[PDB]
Design a protein around this nucleic acid. Structure first.
Lengths: 155, 459, 476
DNA sequence: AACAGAGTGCGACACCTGATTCCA
DNA sequence: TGGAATCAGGTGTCGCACTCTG
C-alpha cells in the first residue's frame, strides 16, 4: 500500500459505550482529522444516547465518510473495528447486489446507516478503508478512545 | 505401648510458660498445675485416644458404590509413611482385612522432606446421606476423629490399598462426609455444663476476666477431659495471651467485620471510574439515584488526564449516597423458605459481600473486611479466598440452600466434573472441598464488576 | 523325598546360566557356589509345587448356591497328558477324590510344549461370589516407573497358585469331574477370580523391605551397578524365598545380564524398546479380510502406541473404516494397504524410550498442527523423551480457532501429565506468549462452549504448575 | 465356550446450553 | 430495538468389541 505521506488526509475514528443508570447504555464517538510528520488537524466528539458499542462505531464511520466527502483528495480511514471493514470489503458487491440483505435473506441491522456507507463509498471510490490493529497510530487511538468516553459520559 | 519418636514435651511446656504473659507466681502455680496432670499430653507421635461411647453407624448409603483405581506412589515418600502406617497398625485402629471397596490414596510433600498421605473419598461421599473476655485460652484436640469407634458391619467402606494389601479403619476416617458433624455433636455436649466455652471442629476456647477463675475453669476442664478420654497437642495450642488466633481471625480484648463501608478520598480518574462501576448496581432500585449521581458525571465530563479537582462537595455527595444506600433503603426482611444467594467481590485492599433472596431486588445485609499487613503481601487469590471463607461463615450463620457468586472458577470446576478425570488436587483444595462436599451450597462465576484499582478504607 | 514323573536336568540349566552371564571367572565361581549351596530352592521335577506357611484363606463368602453342571466334549490329544498331570497332583496330595454338591467343568488349553495347561470355567460360581477390589496390578505404571541400572536380573515364580491352601469348609466349591470320578482342590484354584488378587497381595507383602524391587504377579525385577551389592541383594532374596517356601525355575528366569525381556519389552543399556519377536509378528501380517481379523490387527498395533511421536494420524482412516462397513465384510482400497505399509515401515524405524525420575521436575512440550496435536515429555536436563502422545481433532473441534486448538491440546496432555507428576512441580513450554492476556480474552471472539472454557481456565490457579514461552519449531 | 489388570475405540439415550425467531 | 419461547446440538453415562501381560 502507498505510504501515508501521499494521501490527502487520514481520519481516526473510535467509539465507546458505557452502562447507564433506566437507561441501558450511553455511547460517544471520537473522530480526528489529520493532514500529513503527523499533524492531527482537528477533532470532533459527539454523544448519541442509548445504543450499544457497535452502533457507536458505525455512526462514527458514517461521520468519517461524510467528512471525507467534504474533503478533497483521496484519504484514508483507521478505526478500532476490523469487523466492519472486513465485512464491507468482502460483501459490498453482494451487499448492493442482493438488495441490502444478508446471507439469511434478512435486512441486516443498521439498514439506513449501511446504505449511507455504501453510497458514500461508491461515489468516492478512491478512499482507503483499513485498520492496522504498537505503532504510530497508538496515540491517536488513545486520544480517540478518551474522546469517545467523553462523549458517552456527557449525559 | 511403644511409639517410634518422642517429642520434646518439656521444651514445649517451658515455651508455653514463657509465652503466657502472667505474673511470676501465677506462672509458677500454673506450671505446677500443668505438671500435676502429666499424663495429659501425647508425648508419642501419632498417639491415639479412646472413647467408650457406643460405636456409630456410617454405612447408611442405600446404593452400592463402585471401586476406584489406584496409581503408583513415589519411592521417596515410602519410608516415613510406611513407619506411620506401621505405628497406626500397632495401635490397633488399622487392621489387614479384605473388602470389596478400595479408596485412592496419594502423598503430598510437607515443608520438610517428610510426606503426608491423603485419601480421596469423593466417590464414597457421593452416595452417603447426611443429617468474650480479656483473658483468653485455647486448647485443641489431636486427631480427635480417631476417637469414635465404628460399627463392625460398616468397616468395609474405609478400606484402601497400601503396599498391595487392603487396610481397614476402626475409627472415624479423615475427610469423611458426616464425620466432622458427628464429632462436633459429641464434643459440644461433652461440656454442656460449663458456660462461656466455644468449640470449633478441633480447637476449644475459653475466656475469663480474672486469674483465679481461669485457674478454676482450666482445672475443671482438664478433669472433665481426662474423664472423657481425650489427648491434647501442646504444640498447636496457646493460652493466657491478650491476642489469639481462632476461626481465621485475631482476637483482641472485649467486631472486626463491620457495616460502615466508606471510602478514602479519590486521587485519579481510575479511582472514580472504579467507584462508578461499583455503584452502577444501585440504579436498579434507588429512584433518586440519578440526581445524586449527576454531580459525578459532571465531574468526569469536565476533567481531563489523570489530574482531578474533587472538592469537599463531592465528598458530601458520596457520603450522602453511602448513607442513603445503607440506612434503611429498600432493605427487606429475609425469607426462611427462599434459598439464600450471596454475591462477593474482592479489592486489592478490602472486599465486599452482598446478600439477596431468590435473586431478590433488594440487598439483605452488607459486609466488609480490612486486610492487615500479613495478607497485604499475599497473592490476590489468597485474599479473595479468605474473604470468601469469611463470607461463607456469615452466610451460613444467617441461613437452607445457599448459592455463591464469586470470580473464582476452580470452585465450580471441582463442583461438577465427570469421573474419568478426577485425579488429585492441591493441599488447600481439600480444605475447601470439605465445604464443597455438601450439595446444599453451589458456586458460580460471572465476571462482573472488576475493581483492580480503588481507594482504601478510612482510618 | 519327592518322586514326580519327569526328572529335569538341573545341572544343564545351571551350566547354561553360569555360561550366559557377563561376570568374570572368579565372579562366575562365586555365583556357581551361591546357586549350588541353595540347591533346595529350585524345582527338580516336572509339575513340582510348593507349600506356604500361613493361615488359610476363605473364599466361601457366597450366600446362595449355583446349579452344578456337566462336562462337554474333550480334546483327544491332551487326554494322556492331563491324566498324567492329575496322577502327579494326586501323588503330591493336592487333589483329593471326594464327592460334593457342586461340580465344575474341565477344559484343556494348548501350551508351548506338547503339554497342556489346566484351566477351568467358573461362570455361575463367579456370578454368585462377591469380588475383592484391591487394585495392585498396573503393568504400565511399573514399566514406566522402574529404575534402570547397569546389571539387570529377574526371577519368575512357577506353579505359584498351587502353594496357598484354603479353609477346610470352603473346599467343596472347587469340585470337578474327571472320568466319572469327583475331585476337590486343596489350594487356590487357577481360573478363580480372587486368586490373582490374593497371590499378588501375598507376593508384594513378601518383598516390602528390599530396596529397588519391581514386583508383578509372578515376576520380580531389579537392576544394580556393581557385583557385590547385586550378590548381596540376590542372596537375601534367595533366603527370603527359602523361608517363604516358594520355588523358582531356571528356564523362566535369568539374572546378571545387560539386555533382558520384561512384560514383552526389551530393556537394554540405552533404554526400553520393542523386541525382535514382535517386529517379526508385525512384518508377517497380510491384508485383513474380516472385521474380527481387522480388530485384532489394530489391537496389536495399538499395543505399542507410545513408541512414535506421530502415531495417531495415520491410523485414523483404518478406525474410520470399521464404522463404514456393516458385519464381517469390509470394503478395502489400495490406499488403506499403502497406509499399512507406511505404518509398518514407521514401526521398523522406531526409537527406544527412557525412564521417569522421581527427584526432578517433569517437563511437557506441546505443539499443534491444523489437523493434529503433538505432545512430548522430558526430565530436567534430559533430551530423550519418556513417551509420545498425539491427538486427532474431531469435526466439532475443527471449527475452533488456533488458540482453542492449542488450549484443548494443553488440557488433553496435562490430563495424564498430572498423573505422571507424582507430586513434583510441572513446567510447560508452549508457543503461547502469555496467559494473563488469555484470561483477558473477550467473549465476542471465542466460539467454543463456556463449559470447556471454565475447565481450561481452572489450570491457571494450580500452585504446582507454571508456564514458559519459547518460539521454536513453528508450523501451520 | 475362563479370569484379574491395562490400553484404545465405537454406539445408543439423557440433559441441558445456546441460537433462531417471533412478538411487543 | 429488545426481549424470552422453542429447538437443535454438545457433553456425560453405560454398553460393546479387540489387543496384550500373567
Amino acid at each position: 500500500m502507498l505510504p501515508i505521506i501521499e494521501y490527502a488526509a487520514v481520519f481516526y475514528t473510535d467509539g465507546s459505550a458505557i452502562r447507564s443508570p433506566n437507561k441501558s447504555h450511553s455511547s460517544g464517538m471520537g473522530i480526528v482529522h489529520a493532514v500529513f510528520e503527523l499533524t492531527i488537524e482537528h477533532q470532533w466528539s459527539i454523544p448519541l444516547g442509548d445504543h450499544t458499542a457497535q452502533y457507536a462505531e458505525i455512526s462514527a464511520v458514517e461521520f468519517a465518510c461524510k467528512k471525507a466527502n467534504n474533503i478533497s483528495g483521496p484519504v484514508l480511514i483507521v478505526t478500532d473495528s476490523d469487523y466492519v471493514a472486513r465485512s464491507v470489503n468482502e460483501e459490498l458487491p453482494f451487499w448492493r447486489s442482493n438488495g441490502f440483505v444478508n446471507n439469511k435473506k434478512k435486512p441486516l441491522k443498521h439498514i439506513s446507516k449501511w446504505k449511507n456507507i455504501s453510497d458514500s463509498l461508491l461515489l468516492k471510490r478512491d478512499i482507503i478503508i483499513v485498520h492496522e490493529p504498537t505503532s504510530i497510530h497508538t496515540q491517536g487511538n488513545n486520544l480517540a478512545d478518551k474522546l469517545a468516553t467523553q462523549g458517552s459520559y456527557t449525559v | 505401648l511403644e511409639l517410634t519418636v518422642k517429642l520434646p514435651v518439656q521444651d514445649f511446656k517451658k515455651e508455653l510458660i514463657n509465652k503466657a504473659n502472667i505474673n511470676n507466681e501465677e506462672k509458677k502455680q500454673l506450671a505446677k498445675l500443668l505438671d500435676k496432670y502429666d499424663v495429659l499430653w501425647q508425648q508419642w507421635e501419632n498417639q491415639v485416644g479412646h472413647r467408650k461411647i457406643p460405636p456409630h453407624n456410617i454405612a447408611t448409603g442405600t446404593v452400592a458404590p463402585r471401586p476406584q483405581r489406584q496409581y503408583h506412589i513415589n519411592t521417596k515418600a515410602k519410608p516415613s509413611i510406611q513407619q506411620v502406617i506401621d505405628d497406626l497398625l500397632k495401635q490397633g485402629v488399622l487392621i489387614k482385612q479384605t473388602s470389596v471397596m478400595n479408596t485412592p490414596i496419594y502423598p503430598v510433600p510437607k515443608p520438610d522432606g517428610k510426606w503426608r498421605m491423603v485419601l480421596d473419598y469423593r466417590a464414597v461421599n457421593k452416595t452417603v446421606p447426611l443429617i468474650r473476655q480479656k483473658y483468653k485460652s485455647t486448647i485443641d484436640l489431636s486427631n480427635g476423629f480417631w476417637a469414635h469407634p465404628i460399627t463392625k458391619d460398616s468397616q468395609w467402606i474405609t478400606a484402601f490399598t497400601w503396599e498391595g494389601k487392603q487396610h481397614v479403619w476402626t475409627r472415624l476416617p479423615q475427610g469423611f462426609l458426616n464425620s466432622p458433624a458427628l464429632f462436633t455433636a459429641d464434643v459440644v455436649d461433652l461440656l454442656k455444663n460449663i458456660p462461656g466455652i466455644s468449640v470449633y471442629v478441633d480447637d476449644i476456647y475459653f475466656s475469663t476476666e480474672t486469674v483465679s477463675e481461669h485457674l478454676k475453669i482450666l482445672e475443671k476442664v482438664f478433669k472433665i477431659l481426662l474423664e472423657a478420654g481425650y489427648i491434647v497437642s501442646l504444640k498447636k495450642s496457646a493460652l493466657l495471651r491478650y491476642e489469639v488466633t481462632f476461626l481465621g481471625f485475631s482476637i483482641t480484648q472485649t467486631s472486626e467485620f463491620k457495616d460502615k463501608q466508606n471510602i478514602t478520598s479519590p486521587r485519579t480518574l481510575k479511582e472514580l471510574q472504579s467507584i462508578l462501576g461499583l455503584f452502577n448496581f444501585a440504579r436498579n432500585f434507588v429512584p433518586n439515584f440519578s440526581e445524586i449521581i449527576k454531580p459525578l458525571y459532571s465531574l468526569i465530563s469536565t476533567a481531563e488526564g489523570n489530574n482531578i479537582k474533587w472538592t469537599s462537595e463531592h465528598t458530601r455527595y458520596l457520603e450522602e449516597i453511602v448513607s442513603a444506600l445503607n440506612h434503611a433503603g429498600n432493605l427487606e426482611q429475609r425469607d426462611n423458605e427462599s434459598p439464600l444467594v450471596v454475591k462477593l467481590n474482592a479489592s486489592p485492599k478490602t472486599g465486599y459481600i452482598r446478600y439477596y433472596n431468590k435473586g431478590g431486588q433488594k440487598p439483605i445485609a452488607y459486609a466488609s473486611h480490612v486486610f492487615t499487613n500479613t495478607e497485604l503481601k499475599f497473592t490476590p487469590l489468597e485474599k479473595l479466598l479468605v474473604t470468601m471463607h469469611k463470607a461463607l461463615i456469615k452466610a451460613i450463620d444467617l441461613a437452607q440452600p445457599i448459592e455463591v457468586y464469586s470470580p473464582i472458577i476452580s470452585m465450580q470446576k471441582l463442583q461438577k466434573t465427570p469421573l474419568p478425570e478426577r485425579k488429585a488436587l492441591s493441599t488447600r483444595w481439600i480444605t475447601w472441598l470439605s465445604y464443597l462436599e455438601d450439595p446444599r451450597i453451589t458456586f458460580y462465576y460471572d465476571k462482573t464488576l472488576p475493581d483492580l484499582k480503588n481507594v482504601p478504607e478510612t482510618v
